[PDB]
Amino acid sequence: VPNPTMPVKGAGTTLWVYKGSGDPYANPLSDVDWSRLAKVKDLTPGELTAESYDDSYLDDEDADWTATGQGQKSAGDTSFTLAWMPGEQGQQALLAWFNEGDTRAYKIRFPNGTVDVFRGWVSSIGKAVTVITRTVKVTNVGRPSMAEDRST
Amino acid sequence: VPNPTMPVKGAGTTLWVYKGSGDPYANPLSDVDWSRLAKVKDLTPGELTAESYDDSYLDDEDADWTATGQGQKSAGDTSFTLAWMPGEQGQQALLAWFNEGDTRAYKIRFPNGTVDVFRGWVSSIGKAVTVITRTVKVTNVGRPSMAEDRST
Amino acid sequence: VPNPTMPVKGAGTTLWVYKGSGDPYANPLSDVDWSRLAKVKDLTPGELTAESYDDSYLDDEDADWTATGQGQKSAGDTSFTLAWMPGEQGQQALLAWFNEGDTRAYKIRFPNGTVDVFRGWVSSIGKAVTVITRTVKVTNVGRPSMAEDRST
Amino acid sequence: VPNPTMPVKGAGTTLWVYKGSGDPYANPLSDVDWSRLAKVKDLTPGELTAESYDDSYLDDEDADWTATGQGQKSAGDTSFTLAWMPGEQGQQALLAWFNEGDTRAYKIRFPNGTVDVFRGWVSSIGKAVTVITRTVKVTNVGRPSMAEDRST
Amino acid sequence: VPNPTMPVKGAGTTLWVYKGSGDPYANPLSDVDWSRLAKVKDLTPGELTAESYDDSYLDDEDADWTATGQGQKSAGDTSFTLAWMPGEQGQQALLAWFNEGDTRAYKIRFPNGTVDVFRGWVSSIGKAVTVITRTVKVTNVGRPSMAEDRST
Amino acid sequence: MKTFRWKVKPGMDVASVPSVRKVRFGDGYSQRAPAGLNANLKTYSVTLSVPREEATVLESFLEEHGGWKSFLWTPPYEWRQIKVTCAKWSSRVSMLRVEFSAEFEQVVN
Amino acid sequence: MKTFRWKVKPGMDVASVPSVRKVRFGDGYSQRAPAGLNANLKTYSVTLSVPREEATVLESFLEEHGGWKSFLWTPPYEWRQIKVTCAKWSSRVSMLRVEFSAEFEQVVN
Amino acid sequence: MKTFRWKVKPGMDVASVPSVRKVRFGDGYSQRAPAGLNANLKTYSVTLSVPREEATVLESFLEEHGGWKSFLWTPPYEWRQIKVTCAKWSSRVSMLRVEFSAEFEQVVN
Amino acid sequence: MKTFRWKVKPGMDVASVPSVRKVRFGDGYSQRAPAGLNANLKTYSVTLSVPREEATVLESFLEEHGGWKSFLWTPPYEWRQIKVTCAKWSSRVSMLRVEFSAEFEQVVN
Amino acid sequence: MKTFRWKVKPGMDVASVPSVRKVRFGDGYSQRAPAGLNANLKTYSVTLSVPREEATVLESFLEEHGGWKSFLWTPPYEWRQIKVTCAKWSSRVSMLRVEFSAEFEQVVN
Amino acid sequence: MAVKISGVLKDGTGKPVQNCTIQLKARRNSTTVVVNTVGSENPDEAGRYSMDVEYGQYSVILQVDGFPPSHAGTITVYEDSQPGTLNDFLCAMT
DSSP, X not given: OOOSSSOOOOOOOOEEEOOSSSOTTTOTTOOSSOEEEXXXXXXXXXXXXXXXXXXXXXXXXXXXXXXXXXXXXXXXXXXXXXXXXXXXXXXXXXXXXXXXXXXXXXXXXXXXSOEEEEEEEEEEEOXXXXXXXXXXXXXXXXXXXXXXXXXX | OOOSSSOOOOOOOOEEEOOSSSOTTTOTTOOSSOEEEOOEEEEEOOOEXXXXXXXXXXXXXXXXBOOEEEEEXXXXXXXXXXXXXXXXXXXXXXXXXXXXXXXXXXXXXXXXXXXXXXXXXXXXXXXXXXXXXXXXXXXXXXXXXXXXXXXX | OOOSSSOOOOOOOOEEEOOSSSOTTTOTTOOSSOEEEOOEEEEEOOOXXXXXXXXXXXXXXXXXXXXEEEEEEEOOEEEEEEEOOSSSHHHHHHHHHHHHOOOEEEEEEOTXXXXXXXXXXXXXXXXXXXXXXXXEEEEEXXXXXXXXXXXX | OOOSSSOOOOOOOOEEEOOSSSOTTTOTTOOSSOEEOOOEXXXXXXXXXXXXXXXXXXXXXXXXXXXXXXXXXXXXXXXXXXXXXXXXXXXXXXXXXHHHTOOEEEEEEXXXXXXXXXXXXXXXXXXXXXXXXXXXXXXXXXXXXXXXXXXX | OOOTTSOOOOSOOEEEEOOSSSOTTTOTTOOSSOEEOOOEEEEEOOOBEEEEEXXXXXXXXXXXXXXXXXXXXXXXXXXXXXXXXXXXXXXXXXXXXXXXXXXXXXXXXXXXXXEEEEEEEEEEEOOBTTTTEEEEEEEEOSOOBOHHHHOO | OOBOOOOOOSOEEEEEXXXXXXXXXXXXXXXXXXXXXXXXXXXXXXXXXXXXHHHHHHHHHHHHSTTTOOEEEOOTTOXXXXXXXXXXXXXXXXXXXXXXXXXXXXXXX | OOOOOOOOOTTOEEEEOOOOOOOOOSSSOOOOOOOSSSOOOXXXXXXXXXXXXXXXXXXXXXXXXXXXXXEEXXXXXXXXXXXXXXXXXXXXXXXXXXXXXXXXEEOOX | OOOOOOOOOTTOEEEOOOOOOOOOOTTSOOOOOOOSSSOOOOEEXXXXXXXXXXXXXXXXXXXXXXXXXXXXXXXXXXXXXXXXXXXXXXXXXXXXEEEEEEEEEEOOO | OOOOOOOOOSOOEEEOOOXXXXXXXXXXXXXXXXXXXXXXXXXXXXXXEEEGGGHHHHHHHHHHTTTTOOEEEOOTTOSOOEEEEXXXXXXXXXXXXXXXXXXXXXXXX | OOBOOOOOOTTOEEEEOOOOOOBOOSSSOOBOOOOSXXXXXXXXXXXXXXXXXXXXXXXXXXXXXXXXXXXXXXXXXXXXXXXXXXXXXXXXXXXXXXXXEEEEEEOOO | OEEEEEEEOBOTTSSBOOSOOEEEEEOSOOSSOOSSOOOOXXXXXXXXXXXXXXXXXXXXXXXXXXXXXXXXXXXXXXXXXXXXXXXXXXXXXX
């Protein structure tokens, strides 16, 4: 039974890319419009880093102790390798998207049930010639919506 | 029996995050308000470093030997990997804390019997695919109160 | 049967270099003019990376989240190792190409049935002294035509 | 029997830290005043580096051979890991020394019978949460006295 | 039988150095004048790199793709380790050549039957004290005549 | 009067030197006066970065006013709707995007 | 008379050039006099950094005083409650927080 | 009148300083006039890189005009066929290619 | 007459320009004279770094002499006990230590 | 009339400013004239690097002409052989090789 | 047809706010509105505003010659709504 509060092994872990027009965050749970990418070999999602700004002051009572805060957080880079599939429309659209090069939204789903949506642009398309596989990585732009926001 | 003067294997080592208002340093031994985090895969605590300033001066008797003093001691960065639990309230609060981004205080408890309190802000959030785990990294700010300060 | 929609091991993976005059992009499926290279030990194809440019603005209604766009995409570097074949005319032509140094076009064929065409100039020639192999690396110039552009 | 001119396995290798007032170099052989640290897991003493100053000259008979002399020698950094044990007064005083932050003297003893004395200030305090251990390193200042100076 | 178009294991791979006066490229196949180096442990020949110069232009009709040409190709660095021998005249000549330090020509011969001639100056003389070996490396200067030019 | 709605990049500069009447006496006691009534007039250093396609448009607009006409422009987040002139714009056309580095001098009506 | 309670970031610079009546001999003996009573008047270079939402407030304060009105200010840890006026300040509005660089010149009453 | 069909490397710089009749008063009211008709005249900074074979040809072409003759030139992608004259150019001969750095001042017929 | 026993950080700079009477003729024959009896007077550039606690004490001592009184000071290892005066000093205040960077100009009695 | 045969290191620079008679009229109409007949005279910046053995030889040759004699020199790959004079040169002697930096100003007969 | 949006704009302390500027940024093309089109409206001294809004999706922007534009929300106008105050749409269920 797919539900949170218990760990999941992560077998399915499907990946979809948006094709239509509208708000991706309006309802990510419906796959009416998004296209699935088939037989991914592996996937490393992006990590939401931050950046530290200095805060230490002269007249502050506590000296000899550095002080700093956070600001201007940025999303990470997603990477995934699939089987090189020049027939299916998935990677055809992926490569056309890269060649034309615009920001697009995509999503990852868990056996858990919860859904994650990112948006960004692709910056690499690799290849291997031993069990042919295609590796592609994208960089995110703007605010992503994690699954925890949806869970509320 | 939990008490010092004998080494501890370190099995339990619970992790708590403050939730209420007041002085976390007043009585960290009371878990009345703090929220526990569940099933931490791994943990690496912060590193209390310092900085070196030049103390050697042109007029000196002992020559050809460097002389540096200490200044600006700083806390390190804490990291912990836990099981991805999108349903439990603790990590929902954790991600809300990362999104909104203020300094918060937290603590770690040992089976020895004493506790350790830090304060800072979260700067990194990671994820995986197989046996999904979430990796959270935070950076401290200001002086911490170690276990030894309570031991006396 | 060579046909997409099923993944391919990629055993044959022949390599060809253009020798004639005309448009290499016109019809790479015809091997009437191009010269084949024999006994390729290993091969690594190019990496179509891009570049990131700043897109953050002062009056944006969303702050504390970086925004970068994509521009100036570039091809990567191809590399392959051959059995040292001084007698064969292919290696003689390759070394003459290195010495005289002009941009030339080449292609790699797959057992799937489709081909990939690049154009560039060679930059490195290496060797080994135990089971002699020659390692040759080239850098592409200009936009290449992927296998996908032919399948449509 | 402890005596030099034959190698020693190095089983005991005790570590002592000064507490009283006086000259540490006056007589380190007496442990009447210093406190011993208990159950050190591993230890790496500092290394006495140097610094090279240019000596190449124009009119010298020898050319095409660089000439470099020595000047401004400095002590290294010492590090050691103990079994984390806040009960004992040893590391309590060690942490109080770090927090207050003043230069202090200490010694390392050997099963051979000779003692090495250093003086410096601590710069880091670490921890682990699997068989809990505390790692602490110091940087020396000024001239140390090696064991050879005592053997004469 | 020594002949190209078939791969060769590379057992002999002798190394010779010039001693006389004349044109090394006039006829490298004759060993009347060159002295052989005996019992080389291993060898790594230099690799012929190049330099990439920018070619992109404002009015260039194709944008969004970098354009780079090739120029200023350079030879690599050769290295080889042999058995350290203060007796043989070859190593005596090698060290005299290093100490006096002038550009000299040398060659490597393969079991296939073709010879490769380089010219350069030596820049290192290594040693080891476990089965004594001497490691020596040179940097090339000017055009080397590859083995693929004599075959034509 | 036209308006300036182009969006500005981080790193904008604002400079302000008030015009004051200063006279120093024997042991200090310098008489100070505000000079003109509207003494303070900020000077901004503004950099944009736009793709070449609309680059011409900027020039056209920046050509229309010359250096003798004033246009309204609201600085970012600032509580003021001011009027400002510029006379020293420059551009760095490289491949795809040109960056503009101009200075905007505030001027009273 | 207002005060200045905003915090000052590390690196604030202090300069001091007392006024003397140099007059030279052939060699040495150069006579010197202490000039006026208040010879040296320290000059401070103060850097601040505030989140954008706060910045306007500070600006208004520096607008209210102009470059002709004095205000009390306590240098960090320094035993003196000096009176200082400012006539040069600039800021960098980057994305979230803006940093100010200002000069503060000491003046007697 | 000849033309200029050589290609230009990225990094070309454009400067523009239109001529106005500034005159300063108490509190602004700075009256402004457009001065001449074609007040502004763009100044271009152009960088090229050619192999040494045709460096002599380019140098001879630039020498033929000297610094007194105009020639047509089309700035990249810009909608104008301006006439421009040059009086400063330098070349960095290194080994294989030589890069020319030149300045081009716009002028009406 | 007070003294100066504060420690000096490494990197002290020394300058010396002797005053000479230079006059040149057709082919050399340049007459040279020592000008004053004691012509050359070394000037030192000295930097110190002290914790904030006695920064006030150093500032007060430097204030007492102003820019006119001289004070004895022994340069490091140097064979002379000279008397010096200073007229410029600055400090980079941080939250732990402050560093002074002054110049000491040698004068005779 | 001697000649020059020392080879030149990469990075040599060449500059050319043609002297013209520019006069600007009301609205453009800028009258331009070539000024002198052979107005364009290039100026080269040349660097060499030679071992110390022939440093004396090069210095003596450069001394013989002083700064008042012209010598023929053929710039690399350029067509016309020119005659040039120089009046400034410097050198760095490190350990084995001395590097020379000089400027060669082309002059007419 | 355009719904009449009329009302009075007040701050949190129950007084009118002056120097305002309400903008409606179009997000999707409609039968009579193009994307990326804005329309300004300056209210009176008492905060009274009255506009005619064509049906479609808009984003409200409150420029008070001050703080940057504020995402007070997005407003959707279907062909069933009735004339009313602006705040009703922003508070309406979407």
